[PDB]
């Protein structure tokens, strides 16, 4: 079984995320998905220098219908966390395109919309870009450097065995930064908020940083083993309007993502991520990315 | 007198255009402009390989005040053409940033917003990107290949003598494409609408192309000389939403631009550009870009 091309690539410079709801018969998504993954291969042959990859992923209700309720045991609608601090905007379909060339991404997105046609109603389209020094617009690194290498990324992100082998669970969440609130904080205070130094990205010891620091919120272990994810997040937005981070993560278990979200949004020990002092999430959704063989078998 | 850095560069991959109105005392724009052009030089030293350039330009009413009425003889508010076919959205300030790296442009745009601060109210911010094969989203080339080379571009765009030497007139106009309507047209009929062949961009002669073809509208002569411009246009937008071409042109005389517009929008010979069946302009403004020496002498 073969993983979809957009899950594991590293160092993408640009991405497009499209979120949409089904219109009408769910079975129309079968042929559209097949056309789209075939389009991706065609684009890869035409634009080898793009290093293009893409993912099509499905929300709970639609995937249960398409799969006859088989597998994807952990999949569910984004449930809201923090009594609303992390809202749910769950849709039926996610298209994630990433590469070294925004212009190729755009062409692929057009081909995706043409393949699904009237079977979908688009609700969100975000264009991500890698910023200077691979930093988040906060000035801290963007959180996607690790894990490095195909081998470890495959271990963290890709289901190993069973009917779902080669698949992955996907989480997307758009954040809106308020850089005016951020820049009122001294850099040392920002570093206690994140849990690493800002310029050199040197980790601050857990015993020396507050429990509300982002790293204390999301660096979680179970029986001494870290709950890791493969992040594909990128900055987005305009300088004079809305901007922030489009957070995107792939994982072989949704459990890892949920545990980090429960910790960040006050549903574990009661503490909340200190990053909420300058940025907030405004979307949230969970999706299942099947293997390429599984998509081809839809019809 | 030195030309602002964003006028002459060729083959930029990305740009940001910001249009803004003045808030409060017009004299605040004096030091702000000096700060911004100095920031641009600093960014150029930080990112030499990005081939960054930028332009600050002023609408008629503001420039007349800042220049004490000297020079800029042709400057005026952008008028409506074709009894509304081309609308007017004249603002006070234009900031144009271009380079090989969208991410560098974003940082320069943030520094621009800091430079002008509360002296401006931002009305528009457009992010342009070079599309595949330097084509407009219609599939035709994007109209910016010629004139090639610094010498010819300088002769076309940069005022040669007098108090304004080193300056340039600027015209910006955002177009919204309906690619569904274009897709209903056969490629031969698209080529008669543009005036050139689509894939090869081979000029179609005047004997065969209609006078309403775009080339027939804008390929104009005066006294044995072509009325040339230096176009910095780029595609913009989202696949599922609004997209098109952000048209941007520099010229040593506003006369050249206005003559082309009078032709396109029906005011010269009653005929209108055939492209209007699939794309329409929704903004429009004229600005004057002073020389760097002239900016430095504002305060
Ligand atoms: C505004 C949104 C966010 C920003 C700016 C951000 C930023 C960062 C930064 C600066 C780091 C440390 C850099 C590094 O990885 O070496 C990091 C690490 C990490 N982030 Fe975030 N993050 C955000 C949201 C999230 C969310 C929503 C999650 C999970 C649901 C998450 C999970 C993680 C994880 C697991 C790590 C690695 C922790 C470790 O093992 O050291 N982040 N992020
Ligand atoms: C949706 C908007 C537009 C599109 C898609 C478009 C497209 C094109 C194309 C395909 C060419 C020929 C390519 C080449 O040989 O370089 C061209 C040339 C040109 N365009 Fe446009 N254009 C647009 C708007 C405008 C506007 C608003 C103006 C001026 C007010 C303009 C002025 C010119 C000029 C002067 C030329 C060169 C003609 C020549 O000397 O052969 N264009 N444009
Ligand atoms: Mg003569």
Author numbering:
A (entry chain A), B (entry chain B): 2 to 300
Sentences from the paper on this structure:
The enzyme investigated in this work originates from the human pathogen Klebsiella pneumoniae and belongs to class B. All structures exhibit a dimeric ferredoxin-like fold typical for dye-decolorizing peroxidases, composed of antiparallel β-sheets with four β-strands connected by α-helices. In all DyPs, the prosthetic group (i.e. heme b) is coordinated by a proximal histidine (His-215), which is hydrogen-bonded with a fully conserved aspartate (Asp-268). The fully conserved distal aspartate is responsible for deprotonation of H2O2, whereas arginine 232 is important for maintaining the distal heme cavity architecture and might support heterolysis of the O–O bond by transiently and electrostatically interacting with the negatively charged distal oxygen atom.
In contrast to D143A, the R232A variant shows significant changes in the active-site conformation, with residues 142–148 found in a completely different orientation compared with the WT structure. These structural alterations might cause the different space group of the crystal structure of R232A compared with WT KpDyP despite very similar crystallization conditions. The residues 142–148 form a loop that amounts to 50% of the solvent-exposed active site. The new loop conformation in R232A is stabilized on one side through two hydrogen bonds formed between Asp-143 and the nearby Arg-131 and one between Thr-135 and Arg-232 as well as on the other side by the change of Pro-148 from a trans- to a cis-conformation. In the crystal structure of R232A, Asp-143 is pointing away from the heme b cofactor, and the distance between the carboxylate oxygen and the heme iron increases from 5.0 to 8.9 Å. In addition, reorientation of the loop leads to the loss of the distal access channel, whereas both heme b propionates are completely solvent-exposed. Notably, the orientation of the propionate p7 also changes, most likely due to the missing salt bridge. Here, substitution of Arg-232 by alanine does not significantly influence the E°′ (−3 mV), which indicates that the loss of Arg-232 is compensated by loss of the negatively charged carboxylate group of Asp-143 that points away from the heme iron in R232A. Additionally, in the crystal structure of R232A, the side chain of Asp-143 points away from the heme iron. These data indicate that it is not reliable to discuss the role of Arg-232 in catalysis of Compound I formation in KpDyP based on the kinetic data of R232A. Elimination of Arg-232 increased KD (2700 ± 370 μm).
